[PDB]
Amino acid sequence: ASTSQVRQNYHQDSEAAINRQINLELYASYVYLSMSYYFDRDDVALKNFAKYFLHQSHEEREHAEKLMKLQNQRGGRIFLQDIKKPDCDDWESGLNAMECALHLEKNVNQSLLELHKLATDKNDPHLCDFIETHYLNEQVKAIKELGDHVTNLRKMGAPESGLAEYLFDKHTLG
Amino acid sequence: ASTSQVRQNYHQDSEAAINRQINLELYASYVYLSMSYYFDRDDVALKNFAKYFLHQSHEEREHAEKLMKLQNQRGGRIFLQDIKKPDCDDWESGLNAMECALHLEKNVNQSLLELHKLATDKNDPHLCDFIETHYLNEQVKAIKELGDHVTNLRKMGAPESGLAEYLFDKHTLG
Amino acid sequence: ASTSQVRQNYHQDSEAAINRQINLELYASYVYLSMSYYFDRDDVALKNFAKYFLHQSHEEREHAEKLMKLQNQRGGRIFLQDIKKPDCDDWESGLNAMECALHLEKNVNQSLLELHKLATDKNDPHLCDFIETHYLNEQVKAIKELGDHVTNLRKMGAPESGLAEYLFDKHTLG
Amino acid sequence: ASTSQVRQNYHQDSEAAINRQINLELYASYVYLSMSYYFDRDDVALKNFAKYFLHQSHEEREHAEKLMKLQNQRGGRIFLQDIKKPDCDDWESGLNAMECALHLEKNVNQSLLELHKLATDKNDPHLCDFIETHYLNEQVKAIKELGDHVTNLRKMGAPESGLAEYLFDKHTLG
Amino acid sequence: ASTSQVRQNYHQDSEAAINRQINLELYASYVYLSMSYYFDRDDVALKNFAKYFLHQSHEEREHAEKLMKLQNQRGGRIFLQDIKKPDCDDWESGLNAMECALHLEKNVNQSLLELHKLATDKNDPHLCDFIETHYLNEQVKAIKELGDHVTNLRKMGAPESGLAEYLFDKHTLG
Amino acid sequence: ASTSQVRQNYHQDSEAAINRQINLELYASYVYLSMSYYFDRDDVALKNFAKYFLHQSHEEREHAEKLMKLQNQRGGRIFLQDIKKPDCDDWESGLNAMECALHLEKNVNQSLLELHKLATDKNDPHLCDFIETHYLNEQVKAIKELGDHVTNLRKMGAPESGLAEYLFDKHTLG
Ligand SMILES: [Cl-]
Ligand SMILES: [Cl-]
Ligand SMILES: [Cl-]
Ligand SMILES: [Cl-]
Ligand SMILES: [Cl-]
Ligand SMILES: [Cl-]
Ligand SMILES: [Cl-]
Ligand SMILES: [Cl-]
Ligand SMILES: [Cl-]
Ligand SMILES: [Cl-]
Ligand SMILES: [Cl-]
Ligand SMILES: [Cl-]
Ligand SMILES: [Cl-]
Ligand SMILES: [Cl-]
Ligand SMILES: [Cl-]
Ligand SMILES: [Cl-]
Ligand SMILES: [Cl-]
Ligand SMILES: [Cl-]
Ligand SMILES: [Cl-]
Ligand SMILES: [Cl-]
Ligand SMILES: [Cl-]
Ligand SMILES: [Cl-]
Ligand SMILES: [Cl-]
Ligand SMILES: [Cl-]
Ligand SMILES: [Cl-]
Ligand SMILES: [Cl-]
Ligand SMILES: [Mg+2]
Ligand SMILES: [Mg+2]
Ligand SMILES: [Mg+2]
Ligand SMILES: [Mg+2]
Ligand SMILES: [Mg+2]
Ligand SMILES: [Mg+2]
Ligand SMILES: [Mg+2]
Ligand SMILES: [Mg+2]
Ligand SMILES: [Mg+2]
Ligand SMILES: [Mg+2]
Ligand SMILES: [Mg+2]
Ligand SMILES: [Mg+2]
Ligand SMILES: [Mg+2]
Ligand SMILES: [Mg+2]
Ligand SMILES: [Mg+2]
Ligand SMILES: [Mg+2]
Ligand SMILES: [Mg+2]
Ligand SMILES: [Mg+2]
Ligand SMILES: [Mg+2]
Ligand SMILES: [Mg+2]
Ligand SMILES: [Mg+2]
Ligand SMILES: [Mg+2]
Ligand SMILES: [Mg+2]
Ligand SMILES: [Mg+2]
Ligand SMILES: [Mg+2]
Ligand SMILES: [Mg+2]
Ligand SMILES: [Mg+2]
Ligand SMILES: [Mg+2]
Ligand SMILES: [Mg+2]
Ligand SMILES: [Mg+2]
Ligand SMILES: [Mg+2]
Ligand SMILES: [Mg+2]
């Protein structure tokens, strides 16, 4: 019930929005962890899909940690919620997982754009800069990469061609 | 509704128990992540407590990943649940966090001992060996380290002595 | 008709079971040798299938040698039998050979699990540890690898697609 | 009269059995120290027998230290007893010392097997794993090495041939 | 029931004779494996006899593999038979094992000389050259080495002198 | 019942006194081993006290070995007795252990001074030189070091200040 000695120009609504973004980044980490181990199943067996999604999982945990750092740097207080189990699930094919990841990354981007419009509305240029520097271009690049992956799997003949997914695994994700 | 081609001597109850252990390891990862960022607050400011618990968080994620690998190696199917928010919370002091971590690691050890007694009861020597090789001695060492930490903080005069926690941070956790 | 000076807690039934396992490992070495040279035929011509199975042959001979060492370390006496010619034979395709190897490795694993249950029943913890340390996880990994191989050959369109087997040879077994 | 904060699944009988094993390892260290200096006498003068047994003495002290570490890791309390003087004594010849060492190592192994059966009976898989990992195979190898040494000294013509013991000293123990 | 596209000047009788030689080389590999582990027994304990025969075992497996390669290079088809258990057995002494190996290598040489006389009779100069280049001088050197070993063990006083076998182990086979 | 060929100017009383000193050095080794593992307890947890006393334990074993060497060099015969369990025990605090070690090292020094006065009385200048060269200054330095340690722990506020013992552990014994 006392103010942080560091807190300055950091609105309560921005603090709460950062806590929601921390949960979403941890959720995205968990989705990619689930997708990774789907491709490690003996009846799927696409090792470079598995490595690609595990690396994406580890990168989302780093995104979450940087937002936790941000909350403390500005004198807000971290508030954690349960990390929901992955809600795309029933992964089906390399193409379907890539399509789920594209939808996930577009939903994360929309959250970040809402967060930026809140920080704009509260005239918080430090938070705006943080989001722009560390999150917005990384999301645009992630979305473009996943779109490229979905396109090549479609053009190659996935998901009906198991040869398509096999060769994509070796040539793009190797 | 068809059996994995790799599955052999892997009981349904063992499969389900491994899924419960995966959740518990992810929960422990989340507890240590929360504890880490408590010590990064500007009104706590113990950077080596923060680094120690972040490293412990990263090690629990690795424990979880190895159990997910184990589930696929044996032809079981991973089933994920929500990762609950940390339930010790209200961290208070370096001593209180160390005491919460000791209780967490003893609860994880009791889960692993129950898992080993199930694998014994189902005559699954591969699973017994996996638990013994990768988990049981790591838990005994973690518990002994946390006990040692709690003892030194108590003897030094924590939690009343902020000088105790400061000097422990520099000398033990540096 | 006199006891070994080293023998201690080594039951006659365990001694005989180790001799049976030595034969089985030499049999598995011979199966993989036969499979290797099938892929070196001019009308098959898949050089990385041939190298993969030759390496597996050499690893089974090492498994057999380590059990012969074990028999002498415990003061048992090696008893050798004929090494039967390979009984899957008529190798047909890369997929069929991989399926034969998966069945072989599951039969070896079942032998090892029976051996472990005998050593358990005779309270021989050294033999139990030997089997767990040197054999059980190597069998789980071999079975998982062969399952993954069978899955990718099926998904790629083998055995009807000779292009599938050719490209698997280059990308997975290269 | 209060429980260790680390203690979990560690039976009082296991604690006491570990204390007895600590004494036995220190006793074995003392036997090999005595045997070492017998071979350094001017009327024995077999320098590589002396070095071999001194190294064995140093290895038994390390075994004892690791059990003392184990007792503290599990939250038991070390209880020390007198280390008895060596009870084979009157060393006589290189062959007789090797035969005394073989009997010592078989008695230590029987102690360890009793300790493992107690840990099994109390469902202590961590202690079972500790004994299997650090002690049982080291005892099997020690016993096999000593048997081999006794055999070669016998076949060479010891203890009547002082030339046998001299040449064994140079070629096997050099 | 169709001819290999590579087959040229390769008589059916030569093909069958190569298959018989493959079995004999695998048999010789198995004899030397059995002899190796006899010298690893605790009541024999001649480690350099054991290493010498294990290396000879590994060299006979290589001989067998090269004949399997030869069969495919010429467009013949490998036909495998059971590998008989060793038929000298009851190894007795280093001298007796060396005498068994000398007899084995003379029987292998007589097989190879019969194979060369068949290839001569069918005017197959490639097969004649293969046998001469890769097998005949290696057999003459093996036989001469084993004769030299038998001579030195006899002259030293084996098998009655266990000191002879011990010192041969160190000086010739070290 | 025959004299050593090397023995010269080595009185029976000196021989017996060296045997008593060997026991005392082994006793001192055992005291420091016990003290070491007291500081490794989870409810003590002073790792550099534990390392300091373990090193002191290892140095006393070396002292004992050098006296065993001395006994053989002079043609005396080693006579071993039981190594008594540590008789200070109930270690209490870093200060109390340091005070016990100071008393132990003063008792060892008094034994060595008695041994030197016996060697003087028997006109054994080699034994006098041995004691002076290898033992007397090492004892004076050990006693001075332990006194310095006791003084600093007292001045720092031990044993009531657990912070004193903690910081001494880091700064003096690190
Ligand atoms: Cl304000
Ligand atoms: Cl909030
Ligand atoms: Cl929640
Ligand atoms: Cl860019
Ligand atoms: Cl079943
Ligand atoms: Cl489940
Ligand atoms: Cl859930
Ligand atoms: Cl450890
Ligand atoms: Cl300080
Ligand atoms: Cl018996
Ligand atoms: Cl048998
Ligand atoms: Cl047979
Ligand atoms: Cl693994
Ligand atoms: Cl209890
Ligand atoms: Cl006790
Ligand atoms: Cl006692
Ligand atoms: Cl071994
Ligand atoms: Cl030499
Ligand atoms: Cl023709
Ligand atoms: Cl044939
Ligand atoms: Cl046959
Ligand atoms: Cl030549
Ligand atoms: Cl005299
Ligand atoms: Cl005496
Ligand atoms: Cl006594
Ligand atoms: Cl000095
Ligand atoms: Mg949300
Ligand atoms: Mg990414
Ligand atoms: Mg992200
Ligand atoms: Mg839900
Ligand atoms: Mg930028
Ligand atoms: Mg749970
Ligand atoms: Mg940890
Ligand atoms: Mg864990
Ligand atoms: Mg809740
Ligand atoms: Mg077990
Ligand atoms: Mg281990
Ligand atoms: Mg069989
Ligand atoms: Mg293999
Ligand atoms: Mg095998
Ligand atoms: Mg048959
Ligand atoms: Mg292992
Ligand atoms: Mg005892
Ligand atoms: Mg040893
Ligand atoms: Mg020992
Ligand atoms: Mg007595
Ligand atoms: Mg081991
Ligand atoms: Mg034949
Ligand atoms: Mg050869
Ligand atoms: Mg040959
Ligand atoms: Mg037969
Ligand atoms: Mg030539
Ligand atoms: Mg005394
Ligand atoms: Mg000292
Ligand atoms: Mg001393
Ligand atoms: Mg007493
Ligand atoms: Mg003087
Ligand atoms: Mg001096």
Tab-separated table of C-alpha atoms in Angstrom, chain C residues 4-6 23 26 29-30 33-34 37 40-43 54 57-58 61 65-66 68-69 72 75 77-86, chain E residues 4-6 23 26 29-30 33-34 37 40-43 54 57-58 61 65-66 68-69 72 75 77-86:
chain	number	residue	atom	x	y	z
C	4	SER	CA	35.649	-69.932	-8.682
C	5	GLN	CA	37.594	-67.976	-5.970
C	6	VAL	CA	35.832	-64.771	-7.115
C	23	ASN	CA	24.225	-66.156	-27.916
C	26	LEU	CA	25.932	-62.735	-31.383
C	29	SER	CA	25.248	-59.178	-34.757
C	30	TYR	CA	24.820	-61.796	-37.537
C	33	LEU	CA	25.684	-58.290	-40.918
C	34	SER	CA	23.316	-60.091	-43.327
C	37	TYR	CA	25.337	-56.820	-47.319
C	40	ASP	CA	25.434	-53.627	-50.940
C	41	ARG	CA	23.927	-55.810	-53.709
C	42	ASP	CA	24.096	-54.224	-57.176
C	43	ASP	CA	20.268	-54.636	-57.492
C	54	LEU	CA	27.175	-52.821	-40.483
C	57	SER	CA	26.384	-55.411	-36.361
C	58	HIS	CA	29.683	-54.202	-34.809
C	61	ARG	CA	29.439	-57.898	-31.146
C	65	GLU	CA	31.928	-59.228	-25.563
C	66	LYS	CA	30.832	-57.146	-22.525
C	68	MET	CA	31.509	-62.475	-21.770
C	69	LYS	CA	33.588	-60.089	-19.637
C	72	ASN	CA	34.289	-63.975	-16.053
C	75	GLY	CA	33.278	-66.235	-11.763
C	77	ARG	CA	31.917	-69.999	-17.041
C	78	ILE	CA	31.144	-69.074	-20.602
C	79	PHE	CA	29.253	-71.706	-22.579
C	80	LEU	CA	28.893	-71.042	-26.299
C	81	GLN	CA	26.322	-72.386	-28.725
C	82	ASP	CA	26.025	-72.201	-32.539
C	83	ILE	CA	25.073	-68.736	-33.881
C	84	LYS	CA	21.966	-69.393	-35.960
C	85	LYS	CA	21.707	-67.940	-39.465
C	86	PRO	CA	19.375	-64.985	-39.692
E	4	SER	CA	22.889	-60.058	-62.055
E	5	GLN	CA	23.665	-57.184	-64.524
E	6	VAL	CA	27.266	-57.122	-63.214
E	23	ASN	CA	31.217	-69.330	-43.098
E	26	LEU	CA	33.102	-66.375	-39.310
E	29	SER	CA	36.348	-65.382	-35.707
E	30	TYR	CA	34.216	-67.309	-33.155
E	33	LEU	CA	36.615	-65.022	-29.483
E	34	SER	CA	36.204	-68.156	-27.323
E	37	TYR	CA	37.775	-65.049	-23.010
E	40	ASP	CA	40.295	-63.597	-19.155
E	41	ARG	CA	39.094	-66.220	-16.627
E	42	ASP	CA	40.212	-65.522	-13.046
E	43	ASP	CA	41.834	-69.026	-12.927
E	54	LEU	CA	40.528	-60.897	-29.435
E	57	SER	CA	38.905	-62.593	-33.772
E	58	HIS	CA	38.290	-59.036	-35.085
E	61	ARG	CA	35.420	-60.870	-39.027
E	65	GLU	CA	33.232	-59.004	-44.583
E	66	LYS	CA	35.708	-58.635	-47.497
E	68	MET	CA	30.841	-60.747	-48.626
E	69	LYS	CA	31.889	-57.580	-50.480
E	72	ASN	CA	28.363	-58.711	-54.316
E	75	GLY	CA	27.143	-60.412	-58.805
E	77	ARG	CA	24.410	-63.916	-53.894
E	78	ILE	CA	25.448	-64.370	-50.309
E	79	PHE	CA	24.099	-67.493	-48.622
E	80	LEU	CA	24.692	-67.741	-44.881
E	81	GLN	CA	24.776	-70.813	-42.677
E	82	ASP	CA	24.925	-71.262	-38.876
E	83	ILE	CA	28.318	-70.391	-37.316
E	84	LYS	CA	29.282	-73.541	-35.428
E	85	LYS	CA	30.506	-73.279	-31.837
E	86	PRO	CA	34.230	-73.764	-31.486
